[PDB]
mmCIF file of C-alpha atoms in Angstrom:
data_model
loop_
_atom_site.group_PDB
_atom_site.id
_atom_site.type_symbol
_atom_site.label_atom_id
_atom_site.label_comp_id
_atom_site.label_asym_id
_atom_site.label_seq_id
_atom_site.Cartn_x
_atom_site.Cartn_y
_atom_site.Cartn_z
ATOM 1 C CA UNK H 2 -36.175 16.025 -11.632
ATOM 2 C CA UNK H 3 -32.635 15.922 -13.661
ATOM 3 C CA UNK H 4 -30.806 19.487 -14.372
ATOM 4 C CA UNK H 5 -30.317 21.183 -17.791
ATOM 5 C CA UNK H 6 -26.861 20.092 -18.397
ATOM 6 C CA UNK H 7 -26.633 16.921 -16.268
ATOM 7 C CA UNK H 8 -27.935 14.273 -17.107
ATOM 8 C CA UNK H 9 -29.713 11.165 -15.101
ATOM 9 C CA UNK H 10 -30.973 7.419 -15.078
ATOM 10 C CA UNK H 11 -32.594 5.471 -12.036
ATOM 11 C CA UNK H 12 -30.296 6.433 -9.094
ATOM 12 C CA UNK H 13 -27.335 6.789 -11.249
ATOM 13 C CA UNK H 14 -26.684 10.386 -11.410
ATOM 14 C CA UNK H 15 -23.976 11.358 -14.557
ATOM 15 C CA UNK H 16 -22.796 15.070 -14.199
ATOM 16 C CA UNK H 17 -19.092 13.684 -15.675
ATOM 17 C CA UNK H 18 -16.960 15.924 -18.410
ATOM 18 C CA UNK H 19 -19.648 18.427 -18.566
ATOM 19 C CA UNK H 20 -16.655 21.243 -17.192
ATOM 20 C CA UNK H 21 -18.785 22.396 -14.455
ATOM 21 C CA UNK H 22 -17.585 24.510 -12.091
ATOM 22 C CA UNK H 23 -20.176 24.142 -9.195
ATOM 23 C CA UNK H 24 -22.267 20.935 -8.280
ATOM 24 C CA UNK H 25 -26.029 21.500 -9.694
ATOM 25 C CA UNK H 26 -28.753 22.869 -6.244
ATOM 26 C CA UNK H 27 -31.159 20.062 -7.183
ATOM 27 C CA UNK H 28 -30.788 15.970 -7.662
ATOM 28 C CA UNK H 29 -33.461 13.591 -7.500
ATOM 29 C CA UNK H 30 -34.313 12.950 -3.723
ATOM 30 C CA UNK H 31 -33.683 9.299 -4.802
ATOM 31 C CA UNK H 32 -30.124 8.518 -5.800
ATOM 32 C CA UNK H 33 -27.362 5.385 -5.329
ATOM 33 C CA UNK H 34 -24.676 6.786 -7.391
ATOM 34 C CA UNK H 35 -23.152 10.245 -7.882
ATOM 35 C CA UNK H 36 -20.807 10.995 -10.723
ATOM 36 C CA UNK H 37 -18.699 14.498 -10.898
ATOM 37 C CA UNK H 38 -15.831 13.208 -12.108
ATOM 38 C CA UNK H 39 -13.362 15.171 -14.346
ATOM 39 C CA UNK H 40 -14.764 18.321 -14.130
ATOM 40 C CA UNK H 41 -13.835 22.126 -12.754
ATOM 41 C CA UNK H 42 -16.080 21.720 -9.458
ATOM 42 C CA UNK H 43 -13.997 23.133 -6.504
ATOM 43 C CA UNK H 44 -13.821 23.231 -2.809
ATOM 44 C CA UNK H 45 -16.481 26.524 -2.834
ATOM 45 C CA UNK H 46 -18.759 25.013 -5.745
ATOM 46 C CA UNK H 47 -20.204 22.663 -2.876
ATOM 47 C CA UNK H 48 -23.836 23.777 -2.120
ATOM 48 C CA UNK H 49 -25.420 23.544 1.028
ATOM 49 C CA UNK H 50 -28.717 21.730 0.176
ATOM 50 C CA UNK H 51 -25.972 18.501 -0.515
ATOM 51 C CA UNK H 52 -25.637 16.536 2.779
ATOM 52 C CA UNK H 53 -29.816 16.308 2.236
ATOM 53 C CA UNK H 54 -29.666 13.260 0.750
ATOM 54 C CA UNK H 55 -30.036 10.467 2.643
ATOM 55 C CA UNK H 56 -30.103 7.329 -0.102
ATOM 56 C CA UNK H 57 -26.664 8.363 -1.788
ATOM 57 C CA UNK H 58 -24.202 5.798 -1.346
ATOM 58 C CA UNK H 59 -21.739 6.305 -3.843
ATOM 59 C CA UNK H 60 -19.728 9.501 -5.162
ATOM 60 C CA UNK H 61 -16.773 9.894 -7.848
ATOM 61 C CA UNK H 62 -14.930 13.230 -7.399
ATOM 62 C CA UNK H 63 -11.645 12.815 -8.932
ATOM 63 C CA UNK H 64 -9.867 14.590 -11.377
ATOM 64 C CA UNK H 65 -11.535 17.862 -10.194
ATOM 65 C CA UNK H 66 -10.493 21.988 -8.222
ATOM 66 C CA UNK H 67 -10.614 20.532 -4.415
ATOM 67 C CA UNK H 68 -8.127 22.606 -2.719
ATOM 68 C CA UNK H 69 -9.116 20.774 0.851
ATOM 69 C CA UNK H 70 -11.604 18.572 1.882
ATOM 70 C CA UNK H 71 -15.227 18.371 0.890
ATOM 71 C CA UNK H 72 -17.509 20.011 3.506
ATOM 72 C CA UNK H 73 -21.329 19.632 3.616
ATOM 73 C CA UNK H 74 -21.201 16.287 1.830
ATOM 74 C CA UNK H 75 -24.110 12.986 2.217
ATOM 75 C CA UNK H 76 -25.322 11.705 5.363
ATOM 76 C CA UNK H 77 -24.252 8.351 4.047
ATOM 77 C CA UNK H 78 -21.211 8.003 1.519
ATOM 78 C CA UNK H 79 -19.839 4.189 1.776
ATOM 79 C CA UNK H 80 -17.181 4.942 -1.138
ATOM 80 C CA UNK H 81 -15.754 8.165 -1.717
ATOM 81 C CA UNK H 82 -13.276 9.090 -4.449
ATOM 82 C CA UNK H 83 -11.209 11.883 -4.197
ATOM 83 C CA UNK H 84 -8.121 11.549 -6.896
ATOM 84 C CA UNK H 85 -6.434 13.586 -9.013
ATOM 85 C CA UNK H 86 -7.180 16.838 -7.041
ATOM 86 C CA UNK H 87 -4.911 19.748 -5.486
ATOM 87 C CA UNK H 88 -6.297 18.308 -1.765
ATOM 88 C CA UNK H 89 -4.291 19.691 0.977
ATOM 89 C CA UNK H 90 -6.140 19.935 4.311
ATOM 90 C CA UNK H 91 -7.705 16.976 5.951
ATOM 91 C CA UNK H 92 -9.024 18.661 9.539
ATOM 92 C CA UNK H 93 -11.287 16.309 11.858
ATOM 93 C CA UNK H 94 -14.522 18.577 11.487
ATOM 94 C CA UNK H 95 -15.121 17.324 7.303
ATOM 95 C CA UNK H 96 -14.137 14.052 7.922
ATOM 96 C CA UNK H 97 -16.412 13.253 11.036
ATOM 97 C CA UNK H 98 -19.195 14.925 9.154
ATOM 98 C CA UNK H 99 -19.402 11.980 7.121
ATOM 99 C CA UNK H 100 -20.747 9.566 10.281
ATOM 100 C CA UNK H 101 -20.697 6.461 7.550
ATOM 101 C CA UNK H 102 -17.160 5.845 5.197
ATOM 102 C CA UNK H 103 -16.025 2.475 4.378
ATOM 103 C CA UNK H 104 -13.577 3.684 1.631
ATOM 104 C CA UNK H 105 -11.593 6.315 0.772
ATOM 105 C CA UNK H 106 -9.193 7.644 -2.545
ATOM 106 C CA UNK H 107 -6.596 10.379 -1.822
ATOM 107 C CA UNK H 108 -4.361 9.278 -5.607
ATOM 108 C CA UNK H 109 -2.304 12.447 -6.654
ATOM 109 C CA UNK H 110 -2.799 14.789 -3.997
ATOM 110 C CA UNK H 111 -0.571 17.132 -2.125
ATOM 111 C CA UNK H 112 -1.313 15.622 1.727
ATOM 112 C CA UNK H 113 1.916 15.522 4.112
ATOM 113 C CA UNK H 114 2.292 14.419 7.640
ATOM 114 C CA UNK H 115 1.934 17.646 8.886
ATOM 115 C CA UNK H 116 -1.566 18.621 6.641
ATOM 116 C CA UNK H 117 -3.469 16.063 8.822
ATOM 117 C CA UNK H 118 -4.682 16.317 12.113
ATOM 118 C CA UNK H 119 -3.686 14.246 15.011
ATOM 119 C CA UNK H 120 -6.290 11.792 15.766
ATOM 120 C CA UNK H 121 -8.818 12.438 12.920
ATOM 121 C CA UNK H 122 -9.163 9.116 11.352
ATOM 122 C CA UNK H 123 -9.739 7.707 14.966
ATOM 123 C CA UNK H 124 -13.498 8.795 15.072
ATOM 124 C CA UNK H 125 -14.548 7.201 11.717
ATOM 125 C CA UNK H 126 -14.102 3.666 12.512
ATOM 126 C CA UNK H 127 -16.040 2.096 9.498
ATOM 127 C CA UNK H 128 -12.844 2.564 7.514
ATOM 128 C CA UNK H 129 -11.559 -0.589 5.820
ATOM 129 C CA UNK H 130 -9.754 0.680 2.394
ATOM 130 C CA UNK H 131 -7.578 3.833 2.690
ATOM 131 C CA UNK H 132 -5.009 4.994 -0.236
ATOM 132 C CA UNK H 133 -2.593 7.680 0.801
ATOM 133 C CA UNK H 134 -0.421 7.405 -2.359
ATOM 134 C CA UNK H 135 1.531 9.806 -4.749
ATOM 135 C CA UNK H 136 1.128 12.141 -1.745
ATOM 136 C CA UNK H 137 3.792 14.614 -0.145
ATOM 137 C CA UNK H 138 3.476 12.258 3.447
ATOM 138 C CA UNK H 139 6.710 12.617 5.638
ATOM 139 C CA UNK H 140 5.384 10.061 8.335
ATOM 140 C CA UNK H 141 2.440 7.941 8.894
ATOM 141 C CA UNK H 142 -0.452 9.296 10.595
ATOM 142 C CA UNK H 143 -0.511 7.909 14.117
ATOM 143 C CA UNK H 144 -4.506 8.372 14.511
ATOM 144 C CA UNK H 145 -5.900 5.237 12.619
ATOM 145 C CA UNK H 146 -9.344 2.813 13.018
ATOM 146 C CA UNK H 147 -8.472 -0.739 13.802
ATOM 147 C CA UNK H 148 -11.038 -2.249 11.142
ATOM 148 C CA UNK H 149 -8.539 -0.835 8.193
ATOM 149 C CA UNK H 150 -8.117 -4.308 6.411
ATOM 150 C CA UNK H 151 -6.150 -2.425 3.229
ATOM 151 C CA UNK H 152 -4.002 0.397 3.062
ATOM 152 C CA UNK H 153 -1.385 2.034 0.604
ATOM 153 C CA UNK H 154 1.358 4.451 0.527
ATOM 154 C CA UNK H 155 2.847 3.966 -2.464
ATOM 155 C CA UNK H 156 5.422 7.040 -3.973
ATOM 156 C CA UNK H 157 5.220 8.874 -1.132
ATOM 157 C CA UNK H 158 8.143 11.030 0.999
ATOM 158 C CA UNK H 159 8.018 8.687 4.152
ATOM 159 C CA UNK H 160 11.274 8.867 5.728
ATOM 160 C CA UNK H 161 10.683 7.604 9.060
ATOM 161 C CA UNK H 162 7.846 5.120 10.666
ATOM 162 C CA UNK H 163 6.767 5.799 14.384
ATOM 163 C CA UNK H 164 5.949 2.976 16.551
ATOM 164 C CA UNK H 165 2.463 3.402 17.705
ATOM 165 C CA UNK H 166 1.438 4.592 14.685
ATOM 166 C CA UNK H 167 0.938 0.963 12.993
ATOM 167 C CA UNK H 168 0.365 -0.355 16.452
ATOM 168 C CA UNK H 169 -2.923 -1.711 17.080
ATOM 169 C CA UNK H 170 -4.195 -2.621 13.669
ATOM 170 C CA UNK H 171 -5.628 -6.405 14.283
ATOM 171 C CA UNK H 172 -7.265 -6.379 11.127
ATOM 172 C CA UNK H 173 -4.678 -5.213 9.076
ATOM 173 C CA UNK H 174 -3.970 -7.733 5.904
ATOM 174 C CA UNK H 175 -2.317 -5.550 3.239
ATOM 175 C CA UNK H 176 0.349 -2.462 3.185
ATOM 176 C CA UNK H 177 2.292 -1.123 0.599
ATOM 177 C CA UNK H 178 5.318 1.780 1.162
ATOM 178 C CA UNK H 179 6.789 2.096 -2.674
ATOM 179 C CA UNK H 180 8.798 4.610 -3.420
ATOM 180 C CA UNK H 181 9.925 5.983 -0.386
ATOM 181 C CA UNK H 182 13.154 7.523 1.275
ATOM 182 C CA UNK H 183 12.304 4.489 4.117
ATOM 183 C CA UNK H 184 16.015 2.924 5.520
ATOM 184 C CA UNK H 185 16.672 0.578 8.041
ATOM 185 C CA UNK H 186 17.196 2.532 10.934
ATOM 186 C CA UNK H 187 14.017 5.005 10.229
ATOM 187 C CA UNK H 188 11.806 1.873 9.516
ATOM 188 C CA UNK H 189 10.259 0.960 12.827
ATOM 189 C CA UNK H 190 12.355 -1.329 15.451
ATOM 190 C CA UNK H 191 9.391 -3.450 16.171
ATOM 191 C CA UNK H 192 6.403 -1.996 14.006
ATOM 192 C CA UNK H 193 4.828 -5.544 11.922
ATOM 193 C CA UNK H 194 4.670 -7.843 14.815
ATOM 194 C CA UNK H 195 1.655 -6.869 16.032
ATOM 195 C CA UNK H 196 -0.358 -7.199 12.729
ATOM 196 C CA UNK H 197 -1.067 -10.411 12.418
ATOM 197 C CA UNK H 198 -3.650 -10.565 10.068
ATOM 198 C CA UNK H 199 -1.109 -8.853 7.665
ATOM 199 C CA UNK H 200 -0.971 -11.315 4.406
ATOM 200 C CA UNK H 201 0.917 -8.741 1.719
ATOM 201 C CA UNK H 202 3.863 -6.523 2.734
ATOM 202 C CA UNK H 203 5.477 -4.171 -0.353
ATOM 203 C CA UNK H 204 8.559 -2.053 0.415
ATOM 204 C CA UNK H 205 9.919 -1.633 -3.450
ATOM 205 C CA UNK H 206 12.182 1.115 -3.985
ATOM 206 C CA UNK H 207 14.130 1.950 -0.793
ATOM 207 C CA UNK H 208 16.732 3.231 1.279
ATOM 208 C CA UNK H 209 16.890 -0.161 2.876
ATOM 209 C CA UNK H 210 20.367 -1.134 3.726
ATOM 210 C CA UNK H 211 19.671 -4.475 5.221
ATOM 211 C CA UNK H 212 16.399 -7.432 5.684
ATOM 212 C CA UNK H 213 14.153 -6.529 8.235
ATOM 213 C CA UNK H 214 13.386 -8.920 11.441
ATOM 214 C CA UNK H 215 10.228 -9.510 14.101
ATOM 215 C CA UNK H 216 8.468 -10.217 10.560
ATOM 216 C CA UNK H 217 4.452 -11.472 11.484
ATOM 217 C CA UNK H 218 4.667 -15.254 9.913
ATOM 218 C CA UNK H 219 1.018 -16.057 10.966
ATOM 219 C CA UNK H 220 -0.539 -15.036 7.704
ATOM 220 C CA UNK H 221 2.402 -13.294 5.420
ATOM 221 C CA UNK H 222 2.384 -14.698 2.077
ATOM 222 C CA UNK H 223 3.945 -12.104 -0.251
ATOM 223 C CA UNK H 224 7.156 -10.034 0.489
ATOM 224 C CA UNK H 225 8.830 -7.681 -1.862
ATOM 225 C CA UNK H 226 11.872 -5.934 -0.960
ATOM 226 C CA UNK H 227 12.908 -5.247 -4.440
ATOM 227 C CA UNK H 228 15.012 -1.988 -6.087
ATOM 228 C CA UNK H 229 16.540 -1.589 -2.566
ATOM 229 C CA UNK H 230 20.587 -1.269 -1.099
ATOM 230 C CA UNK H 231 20.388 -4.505 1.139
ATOM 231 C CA UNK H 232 23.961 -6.160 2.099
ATOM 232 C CA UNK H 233 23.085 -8.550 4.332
ATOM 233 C CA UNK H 234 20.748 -11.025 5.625
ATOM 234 C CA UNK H 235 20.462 -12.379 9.160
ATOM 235 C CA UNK H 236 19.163 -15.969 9.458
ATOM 236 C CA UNK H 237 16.341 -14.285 12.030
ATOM 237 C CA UNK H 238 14.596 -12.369 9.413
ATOM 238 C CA UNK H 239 12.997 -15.517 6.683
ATOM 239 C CA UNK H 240 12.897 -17.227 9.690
ATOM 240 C CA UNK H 241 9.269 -18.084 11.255
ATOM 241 C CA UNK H 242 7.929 -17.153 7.747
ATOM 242 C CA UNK H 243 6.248 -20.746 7.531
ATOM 243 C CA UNK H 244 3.563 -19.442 5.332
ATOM 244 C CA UNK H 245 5.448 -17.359 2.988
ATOM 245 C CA UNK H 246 4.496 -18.162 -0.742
ATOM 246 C CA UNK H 247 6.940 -15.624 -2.721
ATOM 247 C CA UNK H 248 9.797 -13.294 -1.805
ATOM 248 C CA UNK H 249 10.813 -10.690 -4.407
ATOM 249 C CA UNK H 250 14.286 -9.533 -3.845
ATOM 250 C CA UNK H 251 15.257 -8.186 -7.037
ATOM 251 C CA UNK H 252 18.058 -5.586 -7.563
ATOM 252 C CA UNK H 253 19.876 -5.551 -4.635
ATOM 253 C CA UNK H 254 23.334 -5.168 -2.973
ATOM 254 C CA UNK H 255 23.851 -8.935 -1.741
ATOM 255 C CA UNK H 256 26.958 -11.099 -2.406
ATOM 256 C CA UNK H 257 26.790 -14.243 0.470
ATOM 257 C CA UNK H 258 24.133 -15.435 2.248
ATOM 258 C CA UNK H 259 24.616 -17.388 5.533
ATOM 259 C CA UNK H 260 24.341 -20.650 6.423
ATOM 260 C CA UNK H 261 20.629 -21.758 7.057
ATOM 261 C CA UNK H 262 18.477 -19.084 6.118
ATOM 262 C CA UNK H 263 15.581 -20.576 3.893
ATOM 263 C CA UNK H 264 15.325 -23.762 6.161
ATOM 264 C CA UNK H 265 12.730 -22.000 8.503
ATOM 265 C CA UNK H 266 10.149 -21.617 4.992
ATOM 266 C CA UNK H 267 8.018 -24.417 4.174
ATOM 267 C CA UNK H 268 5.095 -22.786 1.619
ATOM 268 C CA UNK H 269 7.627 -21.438 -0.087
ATOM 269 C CA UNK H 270 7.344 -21.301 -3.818
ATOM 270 C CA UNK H 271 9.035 -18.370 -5.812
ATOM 271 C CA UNK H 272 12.684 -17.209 -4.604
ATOM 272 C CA UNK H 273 12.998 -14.305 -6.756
ATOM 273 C CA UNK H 274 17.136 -12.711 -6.165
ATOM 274 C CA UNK H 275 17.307 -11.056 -9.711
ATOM 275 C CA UNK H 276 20.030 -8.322 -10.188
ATOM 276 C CA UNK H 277 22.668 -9.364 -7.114
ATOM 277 C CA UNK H 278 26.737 -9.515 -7.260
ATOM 278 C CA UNK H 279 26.453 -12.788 -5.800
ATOM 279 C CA UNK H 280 30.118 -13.873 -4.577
ATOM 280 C CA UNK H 281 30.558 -17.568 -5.473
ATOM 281 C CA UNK H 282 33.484 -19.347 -3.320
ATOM 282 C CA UNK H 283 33.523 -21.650 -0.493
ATOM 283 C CA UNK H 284 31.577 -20.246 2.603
ATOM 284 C CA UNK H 285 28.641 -19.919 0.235
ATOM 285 C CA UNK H 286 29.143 -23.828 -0.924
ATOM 286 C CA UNK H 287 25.957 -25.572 1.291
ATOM 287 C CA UNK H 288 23.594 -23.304 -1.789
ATOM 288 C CA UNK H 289 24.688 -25.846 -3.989
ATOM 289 C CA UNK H 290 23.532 -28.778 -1.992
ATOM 290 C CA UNK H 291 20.250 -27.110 -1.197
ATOM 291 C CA UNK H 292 19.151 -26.468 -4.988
ATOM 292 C CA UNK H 293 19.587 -29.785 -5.676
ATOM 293 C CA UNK H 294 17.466 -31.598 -2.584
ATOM 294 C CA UNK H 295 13.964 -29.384 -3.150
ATOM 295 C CA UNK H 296 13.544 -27.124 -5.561
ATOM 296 C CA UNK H 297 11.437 -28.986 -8.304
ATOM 297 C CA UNK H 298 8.141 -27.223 -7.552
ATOM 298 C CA UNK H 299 10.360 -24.355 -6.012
ATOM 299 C CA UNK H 300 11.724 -21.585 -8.389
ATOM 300 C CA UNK H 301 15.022 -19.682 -6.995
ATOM 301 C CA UNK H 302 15.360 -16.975 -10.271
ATOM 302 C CA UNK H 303 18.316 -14.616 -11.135
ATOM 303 C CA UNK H 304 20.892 -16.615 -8.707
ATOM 304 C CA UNK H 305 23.639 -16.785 -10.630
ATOM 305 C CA UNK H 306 27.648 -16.160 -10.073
ATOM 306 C CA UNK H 307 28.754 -12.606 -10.530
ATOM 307 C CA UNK H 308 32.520 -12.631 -8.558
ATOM 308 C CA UNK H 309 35.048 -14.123 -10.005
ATOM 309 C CA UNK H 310 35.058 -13.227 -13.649
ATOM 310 C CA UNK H 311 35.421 -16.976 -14.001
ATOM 311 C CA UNK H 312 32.734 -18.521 -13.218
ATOM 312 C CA UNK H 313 30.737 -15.654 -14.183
ATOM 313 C CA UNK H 314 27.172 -16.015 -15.908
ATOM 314 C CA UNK H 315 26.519 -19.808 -14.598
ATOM 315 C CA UNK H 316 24.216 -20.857 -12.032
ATOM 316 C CA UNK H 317 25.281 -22.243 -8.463
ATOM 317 C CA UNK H 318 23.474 -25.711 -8.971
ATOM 318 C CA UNK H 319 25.724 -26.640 -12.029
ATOM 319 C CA UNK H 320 28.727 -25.294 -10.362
ATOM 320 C CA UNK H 321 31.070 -27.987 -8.529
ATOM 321 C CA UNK H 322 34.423 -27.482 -7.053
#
């Protein structure tokens, strides 16, 4: 039943680091998992006896030739991984030809805004985990299922976020946009009110020039705006966050903060402002007060006085004047 080269045990079919070029004609008619990871199989070494098999379930493509993507593939493929690979067009005819996809891997690739087509993902709606990172994305595809529960974008060239694009997404509980050219005008105007579900939000390395408001505080628990250009603050955008557990500001552009801005957060826990030129005078006097009332079983880390050369290197709560 197994080939010469490749290599099989009870469902679990290992073709892996074998360098093979094109996928074997024959595998067992019964199978669970496919393996054809890290080898020289291409976009053309697909054969057509492939989308045959009816108990597959599983198949591991990365690190392999794929110039687009896979045609003539399973009947049934609940997770498909396809990392590592030179993967540039993503058309609605191979994607819909997998009626069945609950995940999907697209690590490393070269897929832009542009490569996909409008509306493809919209067909598919068995889709809960997509990853779109290390890609060459300008935008996020506006053509998305609502049952997407996770979904990353992580060191990506995402500029600018359209509107209905994230609209919709009920479901929705993380996303994560590291490493991106996003600022505060190209982020969307109102674009993470509607996903209320959303529980983890990650926008680490920037062009953010200030905080973001119409935050969702119905299930948000994790925030990280860290490695970005943020001045300012307004008392609108921590505010409603009642479940936030931690906020990650580290290395940014702040110096003051106003008057009543952490008063709206209740679960809050870890108040991480590492690497800031905080400015320590007398409109920023009422921090003082409030590090000494609750935080016991609160952390507030990297808050220290950076203007004047003074008082430089000491924490606010010592501080009196």
């Amino acid at each position: 039943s197994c080939p010469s080269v490749c290599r099989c045990d009870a469902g679990f079919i290992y073709c892996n680091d074998r360098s093979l070029t094109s996928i074997p004609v024959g595998i067992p008619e019964d199978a669970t998992t496919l393996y054809l990871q890290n080898n020289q199989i291409n976009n053309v070494g697909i054969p057509s006896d492939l989308k045959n098999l009816l108990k597959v379930q599983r198949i591991y493509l990365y690190h392999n030739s794929l110039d687009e993507f896979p045609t003539n593939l399973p009947k049934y493929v609940k997770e498909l991984h396809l990392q590592e690979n030179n993967i540039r067009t993503i058309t609605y005819d191979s994607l819909s030809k997998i009626p069945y996809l609950e995940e999907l891997h697209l690590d490393d690739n070269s897929v832009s805004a542009v490569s996909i087509e409008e509306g493809a993902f919209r067909d598919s709606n068995y889709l809960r985990l997509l990853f779109l990172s290390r890609n060459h994305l300008s935008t996020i595809p506006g053509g998305l299922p609502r049952t997407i529960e996770e979904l990353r974008l992580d060191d990506n060239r995402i500029s600018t976020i359209s509107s209905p694009s994230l609209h919709g997404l009920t479901s929705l509980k993380r996303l994560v946009l590291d490493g991106n050219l996003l600022n505060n005008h190209g982020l969307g105007d109102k674009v993470f009110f509607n996903l209320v579900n959303l529980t983890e939000l990650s926008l680490v390395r920037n062009s953010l020039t200030a905080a973001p408001v119409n935050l969702p505080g119905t299930s948000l628990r994790k925030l990280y705006l860290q490695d970005n250009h943020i001045n300012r603050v307004p008392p609108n955008a921590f505010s409603y966050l009642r479940q936030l557990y931690r906020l990650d500001m580290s290395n940014n552009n702040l110096s003051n903060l106003p008057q009543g801005i952490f008063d709206d957060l209740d679960n809050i826990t870890q108040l991480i402002l590492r690497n800031n030129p905080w400015y320590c005078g007398c409109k920023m006097k009422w921090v003082r007060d409030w590090l000494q009332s609750l935080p016991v079983k609160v952390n507030v880390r990297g808050l220290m006085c950076q203007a004047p050369e003074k008082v430089r290197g000491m924490a606010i709560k010592d501080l009196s004047a």
